[PDB]
Amino acid sequence: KDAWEIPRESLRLEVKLGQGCFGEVWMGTWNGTTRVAIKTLPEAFEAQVMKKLRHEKLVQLYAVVSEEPIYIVTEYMSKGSLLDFLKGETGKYLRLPQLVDMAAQIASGMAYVERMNYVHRDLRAANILVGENLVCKVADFGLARLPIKWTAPEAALYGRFTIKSDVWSFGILLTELTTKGRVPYPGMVNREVLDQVERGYRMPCPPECPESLHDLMCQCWRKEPEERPTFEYLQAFLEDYFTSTEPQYQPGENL
Numbered sequence: 001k002d003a004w005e006i007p008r009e010s011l012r013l014e015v016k017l018g019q020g021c022f023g024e025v026w027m028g029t030w031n032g033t034t035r036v037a038i039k040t041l042p043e044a045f046e047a048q049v050m051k052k053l054r055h056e057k058l059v060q061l062y063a064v065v066s067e068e069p070i071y072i073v074t075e076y077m078s079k080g081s082l083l084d085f086l087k088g089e090t091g092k093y094l095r096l097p098q099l100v101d102m103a104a105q106i107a108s109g110m111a112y113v114e115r116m117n118y119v120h121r122d123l124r125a126a127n128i129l130v131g132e133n134l135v136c137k138v139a140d141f142g143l144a145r146l147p148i149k150w151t152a153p154e155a156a157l158y159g160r161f162t163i164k165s166d167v168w169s170f171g172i173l174l175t176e177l178t179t180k181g182r183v184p185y186p187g188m189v190n191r192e193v194l195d196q197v198e199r200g201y202r203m204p205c206p207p208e209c210p211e212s213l214h215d216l217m218c219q220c221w222r223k224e225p226e227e228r229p230t231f232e233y234l235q236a237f238l239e240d241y242f243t244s245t246e247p248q249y250q251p252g253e254n255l
Protein backbone atom coordinates (compact mmCIF):
# COMPACT_ATOMS: atom_id res chain seq x y z
CA LYS A 1 0.00 0.00 0.00
CA ASP A 2 1.30 3.43 -1.02
CA ALA A 3 0.05 7.02 -0.90
CA TRP A 4 -1.80 6.65 -4.22
CA GLU A 5 -4.20 4.01 -2.88
CA ILE A 6 -7.57 5.41 -1.77
CA PRO A 7 -10.81 3.79 -0.57
CA ARG A 8 -13.56 3.26 -3.11
CA GLU A 9 -16.10 5.32 -1.13
CA SER A 10 -13.94 8.45 -1.43
CA LEU A 11 -14.91 8.54 -5.12
CA ARG A 12 -18.34 9.83 -6.20
CA LEU A 13 -18.87 9.36 -9.94
CA GLU A 14 -21.32 11.72 -11.63
CA VAL A 15 -21.69 11.92 -15.43
CA LYS A 16 -20.37 9.52 -18.06
CA LEU A 17 -17.85 11.01 -20.48
CA GLY A 18 -17.43 8.13 -22.96
CA GLN A 19 -15.03 5.33 -23.78
CA GLY A 20 -11.61 5.20 -25.38
CA CYS A 21 -8.00 5.16 -24.16
CA PHE A 22 -8.43 1.62 -22.79
CA GLY A 23 -12.09 2.22 -22.03
CA GLU A 24 -14.80 3.96 -19.99
CA VAL A 25 -14.04 7.30 -18.29
CA TRP A 26 -16.41 9.08 -15.89
CA MET A 27 -16.54 12.66 -14.64
CA GLY A 28 -16.89 12.48 -10.88
CA THR A 29 -15.77 13.87 -7.53
CA TRP A 30 -13.09 12.86 -5.04
CA ASN A 31 -12.63 13.97 -1.41
CA GLY A 32 -15.85 15.91 -0.95
CA THR A 33 -15.40 18.39 -3.80
CA THR A 34 -12.61 17.72 -6.32
CA ARG A 35 -13.61 17.26 -9.96
CA VAL A 36 -11.71 14.27 -11.34
CA ALA A 37 -11.86 11.73 -14.15
CA ILE A 38 -12.29 8.05 -13.29
CA LYS A 39 -11.26 5.46 -15.88
CA THR A 40 -12.82 2.10 -14.99
CA LEU A 41 -12.20 -1.34 -16.47
CA PRO A 42 -6.76 -7.96 -17.00
CA GLU A 43 -5.24 -6.42 -13.87
CA ALA A 44 -2.40 -5.05 -16.03
CA PHE A 45 -4.88 -2.16 -16.48
CA GLU A 46 -1.34 2.87 -16.83
CA ALA A 47 -1.14 3.47 -13.08
CA GLN A 48 2.32 2.23 -12.07
CA VAL A 49 4.00 4.48 -14.65
CA MET A 50 2.01 7.67 -13.99
CA LYS A 51 3.24 7.59 -10.38
CA LYS A 52 6.80 8.52 -11.36
CA LEU A 53 6.01 11.05 -14.12
CA ARG A 54 4.75 14.53 -13.20
CA HIS A 55 4.69 17.41 -15.67
CA GLU A 56 2.40 20.30 -16.56
CA LYS A 57 1.83 18.81 -20.04
CA LEU A 58 1.11 15.26 -18.85
CA VAL A 59 -2.29 14.32 -17.44
CA GLN A 60 -1.68 14.05 -13.71
CA LEU A 61 -2.62 10.91 -11.80
CA TYR A 62 -4.41 11.55 -8.50
CA ALA A 63 -5.16 8.15 -6.94
CA VAL A 64 -5.67 4.46 -7.68
CA VAL A 65 -8.13 1.80 -6.51
CA SER A 66 -6.15 -1.41 -6.96
CA GLU A 67 -9.01 -3.91 -6.47
CA GLU A 68 -11.80 -4.84 -8.87
CA PRO A 69 -13.42 -2.77 -10.16
CA ILE A 70 -10.10 -1.00 -10.70
CA TYR A 71 -10.41 2.79 -10.92
CA ILE A 72 -7.88 5.33 -12.22
CA VAL A 73 -8.35 8.88 -10.92
CA THR A 74 -6.77 11.72 -12.89
CA GLU A 75 -7.34 15.43 -13.42
CA TYR A 76 -10.32 16.58 -15.47
CA MET A 77 -9.84 18.16 -18.90
CA SER A 78 -12.81 20.27 -19.97
CA LYS A 79 -12.51 20.07 -23.77
CA GLY A 80 -11.83 16.33 -23.88
CA SER A 81 -9.87 14.55 -26.59
CA LEU A 82 -7.77 16.49 -29.09
CA LEU A 83 -9.09 14.42 -32.00
CA ASP A 84 -12.67 15.24 -31.00
CA PHE A 85 -11.77 18.91 -30.49
CA LEU A 86 -10.25 19.16 -33.98
CA LYS A 87 -13.24 17.40 -35.56
CA GLY A 88 -15.80 19.17 -33.38
CA GLU A 89 -17.53 22.48 -33.99
CA THR A 90 -14.73 24.47 -32.36
CA GLY A 91 -11.92 22.96 -34.43
CA LYS A 92 -13.05 24.54 -37.71
CA TYR A 93 -11.96 27.97 -36.41
CA LEU A 94 -8.47 26.84 -35.36
CA ARG A 95 -5.70 28.43 -37.43
CA LEU A 96 -2.02 27.56 -37.74
CA PRO A 97 -0.94 29.73 -34.74
CA GLN A 98 -3.23 27.76 -32.42
CA LEU A 99 -2.41 24.37 -33.96
CA VAL A 100 1.35 25.01 -33.80
CA ASP A 101 1.03 26.24 -30.20
CA MET A 102 -0.84 23.04 -29.35
CA ALA A 103 1.91 21.01 -31.02
CA ALA A 104 4.50 22.93 -28.98
CA GLN A 105 2.73 21.98 -25.74
CA ILE A 106 2.60 18.33 -26.82
CA ALA A 107 6.31 18.38 -27.68
CA SER A 108 6.97 19.92 -24.26
CA GLY A 109 5.23 17.00 -22.55
CA MET A 110 7.11 14.50 -24.70
CA ALA A 111 10.34 16.39 -24.01
CA TYR A 112 9.82 15.57 -20.33
CA VAL A 113 9.22 11.92 -21.25
CA GLU A 114 12.39 12.12 -23.35
CA ARG A 115 14.72 13.28 -20.58
CA MET A 116 13.03 10.90 -18.12
CA ASN A 117 14.16 8.03 -20.42
CA TYR A 118 10.64 6.74 -21.10
CA VAL A 119 8.61 5.76 -24.16
CA HIS A 120 4.92 6.50 -24.73
CA ARG A 121 4.33 4.07 -27.65
CA ASP A 122 0.79 5.32 -28.49
CA LEU A 123 1.15 9.05 -29.12
CA ARG A 124 -1.65 10.47 -31.28
CA ALA A 125 -4.45 13.03 -31.17
CA ALA A 126 -6.91 10.50 -29.72
CA ASN A 127 -4.61 10.08 -26.69
CA ILE A 128 -4.19 13.82 -26.04
CA LEU A 129 -6.63 15.77 -23.88
CA VAL A 130 -7.55 19.45 -24.16
CA GLY A 131 -8.57 21.72 -21.30
CA GLU A 132 -9.16 25.42 -20.73
CA ASN A 133 -7.11 28.02 -22.62
CA LEU A 134 -6.26 25.47 -25.35
CA VAL A 135 -4.08 23.58 -22.85
CA CYS A 136 -3.04 20.22 -24.30
CA LYS A 137 -1.71 17.38 -22.14
CA VAL A 138 -0.36 13.94 -23.06
CA ALA A 139 -2.24 10.92 -21.73
CA ASP A 140 -2.50 7.14 -22.25
CA PHE A 141 0.42 5.48 -20.45
CA GLY A 142 -0.97 1.95 -20.29
CA LEU A 143 1.78 0.88 -22.70
CA ALA A 144 4.48 3.27 -21.45
CA ARG A 145 7.92 1.70 -20.97
CA LEU A 146 11.52 2.73 -20.27
CA PRO A 147 -2.39 2.07 -34.54
CA ILE A 148 -0.13 1.11 -37.45
CA LYS A 149 -0.69 4.48 -39.15
CA TRP A 150 0.84 6.29 -36.14
CA THR A 151 3.63 3.78 -35.39
CA ALA A 152 7.18 3.92 -36.70
CA PRO A 153 7.84 0.94 -39.01
CA GLU A 154 10.72 -0.41 -36.91
CA ALA A 155 8.37 -0.43 -33.90
CA ALA A 156 5.34 -1.95 -35.65
CA LEU A 157 7.38 -4.68 -37.36
CA TYR A 158 10.10 -5.48 -34.81
CA GLY A 159 8.94 -3.97 -31.52
CA ARG A 160 11.75 -1.38 -31.49
CA PHE A 161 9.82 1.10 -29.35
CA THR A 162 12.11 4.03 -28.49
CA ILE A 163 11.65 7.74 -27.93
CA LYS A 164 12.56 8.05 -31.63
CA SER A 165 9.49 5.99 -32.55
CA ASP A 166 7.46 8.45 -30.48
CA VAL A 167 9.04 11.19 -32.61
CA TRP A 168 7.65 9.38 -35.66
CA SER A 169 4.20 9.37 -34.07
CA PHE A 170 4.56 13.10 -33.40
CA GLY A 171 5.13 13.76 -37.10
CA ILE A 172 1.90 11.90 -37.88
CA LEU A 173 0.19 13.92 -35.14
CA LEU A 174 1.29 17.10 -36.92
CA THR A 175 -0.73 16.00 -39.95
CA GLU A 176 -3.75 15.48 -37.68
CA LEU A 177 -3.37 19.07 -36.50
CA THR A 178 -2.87 20.61 -39.95
CA THR A 179 -5.89 18.75 -41.40
CA LYS A 180 -8.28 19.37 -38.47
CA GLY A 181 -8.11 15.75 -37.35
CA ARG A 182 -8.29 13.77 -40.59
CA VAL A 183 -7.08 10.17 -40.60
CA PRO A 184 -3.50 9.83 -41.92
CA TYR A 185 -2.80 8.03 -45.19
CA PRO A 186 -6.32 8.57 -46.59
CA GLY A 187 -7.78 5.68 -48.56
CA MET A 188 -5.05 3.26 -47.43
CA VAL A 189 -5.52 0.16 -45.29
CA ASN A 190 -3.04 -0.85 -42.59
CA ARG A 191 -1.14 -3.40 -44.67
CA GLU A 192 -0.88 -0.90 -47.53
CA VAL A 193 0.45 1.76 -45.15
CA LEU A 194 3.09 -0.63 -43.81
CA ASP A 195 4.14 -1.68 -47.32
CA GLN A 196 4.51 1.80 -48.82
CA VAL A 197 6.12 3.42 -45.77
CA GLU A 198 8.85 0.76 -45.63
CA ARG A 199 9.57 1.44 -49.31
CA GLY A 200 9.94 5.16 -48.51
CA TYR A 201 6.48 6.68 -49.08
CA ARG A 202 5.61 9.70 -46.93
CA MET A 203 2.44 11.75 -46.68
CA PRO A 204 2.49 14.88 -48.89
CA CYS A 205 2.32 18.46 -47.62
CA PRO A 206 -1.24 19.12 -46.39
CA PRO A 207 -3.08 21.91 -48.21
CA GLU A 208 -2.25 25.41 -46.90
CA CYS A 209 0.46 23.90 -44.68
CA PRO A 210 3.81 25.72 -45.07
CA GLU A 211 6.62 23.66 -46.56
CA SER A 212 8.79 24.39 -43.51
CA LEU A 213 6.30 22.63 -41.24
CA HIS A 214 6.12 19.67 -43.63
CA ASP A 215 9.92 19.39 -43.61
CA LEU A 216 9.71 18.95 -39.84
CA MET A 217 7.26 16.09 -40.42
CA CYS A 218 9.60 14.34 -42.86
CA GLN A 219 12.45 14.73 -40.37
CA CYS A 220 10.26 12.88 -37.87
CA TRP A 221 9.70 10.26 -40.60
CA ARG A 222 13.34 9.47 -41.41
CA LYS A 223 14.01 5.78 -41.97
CA GLU A 224 16.92 5.77 -39.52
CA PRO A 225 15.50 6.39 -36.02
CA GLU A 226 18.70 7.98 -34.70
CA GLU A 227 18.45 10.62 -37.44
CA ARG A 228 15.02 11.70 -36.18
CA PRO A 229 15.01 14.96 -34.19
CA THR A 230 14.61 15.19 -30.44
CA PHE A 231 11.50 16.49 -28.71
CA GLU A 232 13.72 19.17 -27.16
CA TYR A 233 14.37 20.36 -30.72
CA LEU A 234 10.72 19.95 -31.74
CA GLN A 235 9.52 22.06 -28.81
CA ALA A 236 11.93 24.92 -29.53
CA PHE A 237 11.16 24.82 -33.26
CA LEU A 238 7.38 25.02 -32.80
CA GLU A 239 7.47 27.64 -30.03
CA ASP A 240 9.57 29.98 -32.22
CA TYR A 241 7.85 29.02 -35.48
CA PHE A 242 6.19 32.29 -36.52
CA THR A 243 9.23 34.45 -35.69
CA SER A 244 12.20 32.31 -36.78
CA THR A 245 10.76 30.07 -39.53
CA GLU A 246 7.62 31.62 -41.09
CA PRO A 247 7.75 35.35 -40.24
CA GLN A 248 5.57 36.19 -43.27
CA TYR A 249 2.83 33.65 -42.56
CA GLN A 250 -0.58 34.89 -43.64
CA PRO A 251 -3.93 33.36 -42.64
CA GLY A 252 -5.78 31.42 -45.31
CA GLU A 253 -9.08 29.65 -45.88
CA ASN A 254 -8.46 26.96 -43.25
CA LEU A 255 -4.98 27.51 -41.77
Ligand SMILES: *CCC(=O)Nc1ccccc1Nc1nc(Nc2ccc(N3CCN(C)CC3)cc2)ncc1Cl
Pocket (backbone or CB within 6 Å): 017, 018, 019, 020, 021, 025, 037, 059, 074, 075, 076, 077, 078, 079, 080, 081, 084, 126, 127, 128, 129, 139, 140, 141
Ligand atom coordinates in the same frame (compact mmCIF):
# COMPACT_ATOMS: atom_id res chain seq x y z
C1 LIG B 1 -5.96 8.44 -22.71
C2 LIG B 1 -6.75 9.68 -23.18
C3 LIG B 1 -8.24 9.65 -22.86
O1 LIG B 1 -8.53 9.12 -21.74
N1 LIG B 1 -9.35 10.11 -23.58
C4 LIG B 1 -10.75 10.06 -23.27
C5 LIG B 1 -11.65 9.71 -24.32
C6 LIG B 1 -13.05 9.63 -24.15
C7 LIG B 1 -13.58 9.90 -22.90
C8 LIG B 1 -12.72 10.24 -21.84
C9 LIG B 1 -11.32 10.33 -21.96
N2 LIG B 1 -10.51 10.71 -20.80
C10 LIG B 1 -10.54 11.92 -20.05
N3 LIG B 1 -11.49 12.90 -20.36
C11 LIG B 1 -11.54 14.11 -19.63
N4 LIG B 1 -12.52 15.14 -19.94
C12 LIG B 1 -13.53 15.19 -21.04
C13 LIG B 1 -13.76 14.12 -21.95
C14 LIG B 1 -14.70 14.15 -23.00
C15 LIG B 1 -15.54 15.24 -23.27
N5 LIG B 1 -16.53 15.30 -24.34
C16 LIG B 1 -16.68 14.15 -25.28
C17 LIG B 1 -18.11 14.15 -25.88
N6 LIG B 1 -18.40 15.37 -26.67
C18 LIG B 1 -18.50 14.93 -28.10
C19 LIG B 1 -17.35 16.39 -26.61
C20 LIG B 1 -16.74 16.56 -25.15
C21 LIG B 1 -15.32 16.32 -22.37
C22 LIG B 1 -14.38 16.29 -21.32
N7 LIG B 1 -10.66 14.39 -18.59
C23 LIG B 1 -9.75 13.43 -18.32
C24 LIG B 1 -9.64 12.19 -18.99
CL1 LIG B 1 -8.41 11.13 -18.48
